[PDB]
């Protein structure tokens, strides 16, 4: 039921933004690549404070590293 | 003929199998990301280390 | 701006997150001194602290 396209597409119309974080770890569990382009788009609804928290937690902070060059703004 | 037996037993068998096969397409796609994060940490350490090697051949 | 700051800033503090950091960081054209009182009246200090030393 997985697809790179139709997920991409899909996640920008939801309206629970809580689903982020649990999208954020299932593709840490199974796509950790995938997780700066989902970034990428998720950057403006989606809180940067508790995503660095769970960066932190996880120990993933260098893995994002590219990420955060686009939100020194 | 009353086939709802069948009906219910054929069905039954077949998700179980799916549900196993997909749950070790699961634990594939788990350890294939174990692997990959384990590739990219040690090409970061061996960047960090190469980076301190020229910090410390500048001076 | 209009009647909207409450709907987003006053909500937030409702709810006693760190939703509130981002929202200040994210909402322009907005009233100062007004939420800065609101959050006086509350419980949350920090954010009042933040926004004075913003301006």
Redesign the interface.
């Known amino acids: 039921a997985w697809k790179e396209g139709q997920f991409k597409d899909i996640i920008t119309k939801v309206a629970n933004v809580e689903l982020y974080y649990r999208a954020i770890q299932f593709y840490?569990?199974?796509?950790?690549?995938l997780l700066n382009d989902l970034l990428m788009v998720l950057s403006p609804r989606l809180?940067?404070?508790?995503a660095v928290n769970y960066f932190s937690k996880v120990k993933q902070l260098?893995?994002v590293k590219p990420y955060l060059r686009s939100v020194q703004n | 003929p009353e086939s709802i037996r069948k009906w219910r037993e054929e069905q039954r068998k077949r998700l179980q199998e799916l549900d196993a096969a997909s749950k070790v397409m699961e634990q594939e796609w788990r350890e294939k990301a174990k692997k990959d994060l384990e590739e990219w940490n040690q090409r970061q350490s061996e960047q960090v280390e190469k980076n301190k090697i020229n910090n410390r051949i500048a001076d | 701006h209009r009647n909207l700051q409450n709907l987003l800033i006053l909500t937030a503090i409702k709810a006693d997150r760190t939703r509130v950091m981002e929202y200040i960081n994210r909402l322009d054209n907005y009233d100062a001194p007004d939420i800065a009182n609101i959050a006086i009246s509350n419980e949350l200090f920090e954010e009042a602290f933040a926004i004075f030393r913003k301006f």
């Open positions: 840490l569990e199974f796509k950790p690549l809180d940067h404070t508790r260098p893995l």
